[PDB]
């Protein structure tokens, strides 16, 4: 045993059609009292926000043109105000 | 107190290392030891922040030369790529001995090689103190 | 059998001995100048020589974990040291890392922080009471402050000057043993007491390792660009910039993979935008 071969998948890829799913997100979550933080990737036809709440997304001003400041913000249920 | 200003014409000329005036040793080199109850089989707590297990995927930094201007370094079988650069405190010194015990911690904390089933080099020609 | 290992096991290190407390002058008379100030001028001159020498040896990263504390009054002329730093930083493209200096040394005193009553200078240069050299040359040298293993700043042990630019851990130090073949954790103090080492001199070592890895992956970047890559990826303090820790805590994986802009930091032109009021109904 002298080669890795761990990078390649065991079967051909199920490439998702970007024409159908033009939205993708990186998701991070931690439960209080746990030693590990979970990371997952999501895709879909639209942002993962309820259809009824889609109207109350907040549109930010964008003074910083360097491309490292978001355009929109949404505070769903169980959000947090005081953060470390 | 404004920030520093510089005149590039004043840099000192190059030449072999040596003190400005003759010097002699005044004290005995400091001793070292281990605190009660430590266990070297657990990683140091400071390595958790750096996440080195993931950072090393791109390589271990092969081919980079780091200069340690300090109190010198003492050779050890875990530092297989040490080069003597010179001494400004004592004439005729290689800059390859550590009387203050400070230089070997800084140097070994950067380049010390991990453990292995056999030592890389079994030789030990180390000079006395 | 042993979990310890260096930050960059592949590097090659050059050792130079430039300072030590075990040696002294064997003609103590020094004339017109006081024996205590006479020693500082000798250290400044000898320090400049060591930096020039290390650069001509071809080193790409220079680590300085021994720094000199000096009063704001009675400051010594740095002319020779200033020119040596410029030569090594620009004409030889070396990256210079220096420790912020510990509060346990002979002459180091705590500096004042930012004052909300005078927004003229966000770093409060005018309030400086003590200088740390060569860390002083913030345009060419990267100064590292210290934080504990949890991330809280060691307010009682590091000098909070305006030159402080980044920080890294500085506790629970471990390393190879001199005069032996094993590991160590403490040193014999003046008394029989077993003293444990800590401070910025070790934090400067961690950053010296990370800098070596980064400019192994991006060999095309110049010294000035490598510093900006480390600064922009650090995790910031509650004020965005603070004399206690500089821009923040170092973050290795980030520096090695994020797409940091190649130009230096620039502020936005203007913050306001027009309000799009709806059209009224007839």
Swiss-Prot record, chain A:
Q: Where in the cell is it found?
A: Cell inner membrane
Name the source's superkingdom.
Bacteria
The entry's other comment says:
Part of the eccB5-eccC5 operon, which is essential for in vitro growth.
In UniProt terms, what function does this protein have? An ATPase (shown for residues 80-506). Part of the ESX-5 specialized secretion system, which is responsible for the secretion of EsxN and a number of PE_PGRS and PPE proteins, including PPE41.
Question: What family is this protein classified in?
Answer: Belongs to the EccB family.
Please describe the quaternary structure of this protein: Part of the ESX-5 / type VII secretion system (T7SS), which is composed of cytosolic and membrane components. The ESX-5 membrane complex is composed of EccB5, EccC5, EccD5 and EccE5.
Q: What is this protein called?
A: ESX-5 secretion system ATPase EccB5
Recorded name of the encoding gene: eccB5
The shown residues of the full protein are 339 to 422 of 506
Swiss-Prot record, chain C:
Q: Where is the active site?
A: 201
Tell what triggers its expression. Constitutively expressed during growth in culture.
Q: Where is the protein found, in the record's own terms?
A: Cell membrane
- Family statement: Belongs to the peptidase S8 family.
What is the protein name for this chain? Mycosin-5
- Per the UniProt entry, what species is this protein from, by scientific name? Mycobacterium tuberculosis (strain ATCC 25618 / H37Rv)
Name the gene: mycP5
């Amino acid at each position: 045993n002298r080669l890795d071969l761990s990078a390649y998948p065991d079967n051909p890829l199920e490439v998702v059609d970007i024409r159908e799913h033009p939205s993708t997100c990186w998701w991070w979550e931690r439960t209080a009292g746990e030693n590990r933080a979970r990371v997952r990737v999501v895709s879909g036809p639209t942002i993962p926000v309820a259809a009824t709440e889609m109207n109350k997304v907040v549109s930010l001003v964008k003074a910083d043109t360097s491309g490292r400041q978001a355009d929109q913000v949404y505070f769903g249920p169980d959000h947090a105000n005081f953060v470390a | 107190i404004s920030p520093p200003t510089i005149d590039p014409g004043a840099l000192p000329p190059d030449g072999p290392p040596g003190p400005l005036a003759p010097m002699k040793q005044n004290a005995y080199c400091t001793e070292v030891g281990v605190l009660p109850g430590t266990d070297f089989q657990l990683q140091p707590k400071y390595m958790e922040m750096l996440n080195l297990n993931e950072a090393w995927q791109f390589g271990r930094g092969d081919g980079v030369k780091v200069a340690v201007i300090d109190t010198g370094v003492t050779p050890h079988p875990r530092l297989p790529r040490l080069i003597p650069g010179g001494d400004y405190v004592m004439a005729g010194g290689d800059g390859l001995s550590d009387c203050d015990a400070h230089g070997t911690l800084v140097a070994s904390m950067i380049a010390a090689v991990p453990a292995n089933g056999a030592v890389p080099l079994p030789s030990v020609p180390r000079r006395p103190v | 059998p042993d979990a310890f290992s260096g930050i960059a096991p592949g590097v090659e290190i050059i050792s130079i001995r430039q300072s030590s407390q075990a040696f002294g002058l064997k003609d103590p008379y020094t004339g017109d100048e006081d024996p205590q100030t006479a020693q500082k001028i000798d250290n400044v001159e000898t320090m400049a020589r060591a930096i020039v020498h290390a650069a001509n040896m071809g080193a790409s990263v220079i680590n300085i974990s021994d720094v000199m504390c000096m009063s704001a009054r009675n400051v010594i002329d740095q002319r020779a040291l200033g020119a040596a730093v410029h030569y090594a930083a620009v004409d030889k493209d070396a990256v210079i890392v220096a420790a912020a200096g510990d509060g346990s040394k002979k002459d180091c005193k705590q500096n004042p922080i930012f004052d909300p009553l005078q927004p003229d200078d966000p770093r409060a240069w005018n309030a400086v009471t003590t200088v740390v050299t060569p860390s002083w040359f913030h345009d060419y040298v990267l100064t590292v402050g210290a934080v504990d293993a949890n991330g809280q700043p060691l307010s009682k042990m590091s000098i909070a000057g305006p030159w402080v630019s980044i920080s890294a851990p500085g506790t629970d130090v471990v390393g190879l043993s001199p005069r032996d073949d094993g590991l160590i954790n403490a040193i014999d103090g003046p008394d029989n007491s077993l003293l444990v080492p800590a401070g910025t001199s070790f934090s400067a070592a961690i950053v010296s390792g990370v800098a070596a890895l980064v400019r192994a992956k991006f060999p095309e970047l110049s010294a000035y660009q490598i510093i900006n890559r480390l600064i922009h990826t650090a995790r910031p303090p509650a004020r965005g910039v603070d004399n206690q820790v500089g821009y923040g805590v170092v973050d290795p994986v980030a520096a090695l993979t994020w797409d940091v802009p190649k130009g230096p930091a620039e502020p936005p032109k203007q913050l306001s935008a027009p309000l799009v009021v709806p059209q009224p109904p007839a």
